[model samples]
Target chain A: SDVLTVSTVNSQDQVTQKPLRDSVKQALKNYFAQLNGQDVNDLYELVLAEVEQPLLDMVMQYTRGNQTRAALMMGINRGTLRKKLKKYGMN
Target chain B: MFEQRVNSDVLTVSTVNSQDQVTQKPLRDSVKQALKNYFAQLNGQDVNDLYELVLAEVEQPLLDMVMQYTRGNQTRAALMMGINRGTLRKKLKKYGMN
Candidate 1:
């Protein structure tokens, strides 16, 4: 199950850097900060730590868990797809 | 003192002393096992390097949301991201985007 989706957005032809990534990172942190408490945060982290799993699961669900076809559609190496599954504790 | 235990086929969660802990059980045992089966079917491929992969996944979504919020305006996105526009430009390139 390939979970990544590539999309295009119009931009002013600019380069992006770590600070840009960090900015998004901080925004995510702030967004999660509004959650109830430590337990919620912990659970959220646990879920996030395994993000690729759910993503793959959902993608697989969308594609009925057909790895070969999914990988082809995703345009990534089949080996890479399997590797991500293992890393995310999926399969 | 409060303690609670929750169990399911995939994961077992327990709370003691106001902190949650992974039981002496796999977080998602069933799912993990199923995944193992899939890997076996795939001729045994696995991912050991996860930090960058996870970070990249997280950062991409964050970038998209911020960019959208700024209405595709890099300058505003950088400001909201608490970063310099030039830095944002660099990331945009790295991620292969505008």
Candidate 2:
């Protein structure tokens, strides 16, 4: 039998082309390990924030502070992009 | 801050009452590290629509974990996630997790 690697599926039952899930899993593993048996509040939000900040940062830098192009590139409305930037104090 | 309590084995979002529990953002650091690695692998190539790309990556595992945590009960999962059932269903459908 051929060796099998786990993959995630999309809404269309299509196999996702990236190993992004594995990366997220590894990141979560690191997070839990760092917790050291401590209780965490809002693990979900924490994880979301963790990813969101860097994503916003990269996109903003790539656009060179161009909100219109950045928003279009990110598939988010300009208003939403501004809100996210404000949320992270990047504005 | 609103007070929170642990429900059974799962840790729900809330303020910690314990004095010894220190607050930190280790998860943020880990994610930053991962994102940095991803950018490095890109080798300066332009990345398109990365917001959705990264969101899909993060959301699927999160939904999977929560669903498994709630024993496949969507209601409980939605409650734990603080999202409406309709929204949860939409997300599940989008990710093919349903």
Candidate 3:
């Protein structure tokens, strides 16, 4: 998969020394500043869930809302995508 | 705690190429920009339910590629991904990649 998608998702997959890490860091930075001494719970889930929506939205839009195709493109199963879509009200 | 974490971890940013204009790791950089925008736009709101959001973004492409490698032999894909077959299947279902 990495072999094939490497060429395809050139920009997205490229070794962005700072970008993705930076965003994660920056968001954490803002999120951290907000805390002011409070420790965050479920930091992992909180950020990732927010990120997923746009990703799904993009894949679905580009795939013409086809579950089979979208599932393949996303490397997940159709059933899983179906459930996710239903959960998110995207279905 | 928040301030301390940022202060300690990100404090190194100032010592580096301050502009951070250096070429980026494509995926990380892109994700960072997206996150930066998301953070800025929050207008100081607390982020909620973020794990799935971040994982979905990162995991989708991962599963996409690994699945392609397995060429639809899901068990083979599981082995290739170093996840248990059952676990992989569950993940497939979890992320809808199966």
Candidate 4:
């Protein structure tokens, strides 16, 4: 069987495209500009880390921490889920 | 040593001066460090892009609920949002919804 790569769908059921990507880039640029003198790379990492926790928590809760089910829901292989969990110290 | 403006019965503008400034740096710096540790484990192409994408998705449910509660009344929606009607209209336009 072919592996399924996950993709997100917006509220309007719109598949994210170049326009959405560009908008996100612009928004981050503006946000960084407002924080002047802050390390841009560090800020990017901070935002990503803050976001990942909630995402993992929510998905785990939704799946009741069943790795197989959660992986299926996330459209990733079960091994991939285990690797992510281990990386986040959730193992 | 200041003046104020009053426009009809709808608008009033005033200015105030602060005697002290507070530094929020300490709090912000510590939080930023913790965030760095947490994000260091995740894998993705662009974290910034994902953040905006998730934020936009989360707001959808709130918008839908507000519109339903207002019975599709844009005026009431604007009031509920605490934004001027014109501002709400602009958002609606940007979101590509009637």
Span of 10 residues, lowest total lDDT, candidate 4 chain A:
A1-10
Q: What does candidate 3's lDDT look like per residue over A1-91, in tens digits?
A: 1101111123244432233334444444444455564433333344444556556776566557877776775567678888877766877
Worst 10 contiguous positions by lDDT, candidate 2 chain B: B7-16
Q: What's the residue-level lDDT of A90 in candidate 4?
A: 77
Interface RMSD of each: 12.8, 8.6, 12.6, 17.6
Residue lDDT tens for model 1, A1-91:
4322221122453332122233334434544454443222122244344344544675466457888766764566778888888876766
Can you give the TM-score per candidate against the true fold?
0.33, 0.62, 0.42, 0.33
Report residue B2 deviation for candidate 4 (angstroms): 35
Q: What is the C-alpha DockQ of each candidate?
A: 0.05, 0.18, 0.05, 0.02
* Top-DockQ structure, candidate number: 2
Which runs in model 2 stand beyond 4 Å of their true positions? A1-20, A26-44, B1-25
CA deviation > 4 Å runs, candidate 1: A1-51, B1-61, B64-89, B94-98
lDDT digits (tens) for residues B1-97 of candidate 1: 7566442212322212224333333233323333434444545343433335445655576666556655798766676566667877887787777
Worst 10 residues of 1 chain A by lDDT: A2-11
Distance (Å) between predicted and true CA of B84, model 4? 42
- Which of the two candidates, 2 or 4, achieves a greater lDDT against the reference? 2
lDDT string, candidate 2, B2-78, tens digits: 67632221212111223634232333443454566665666766655767777777788888766765689987777
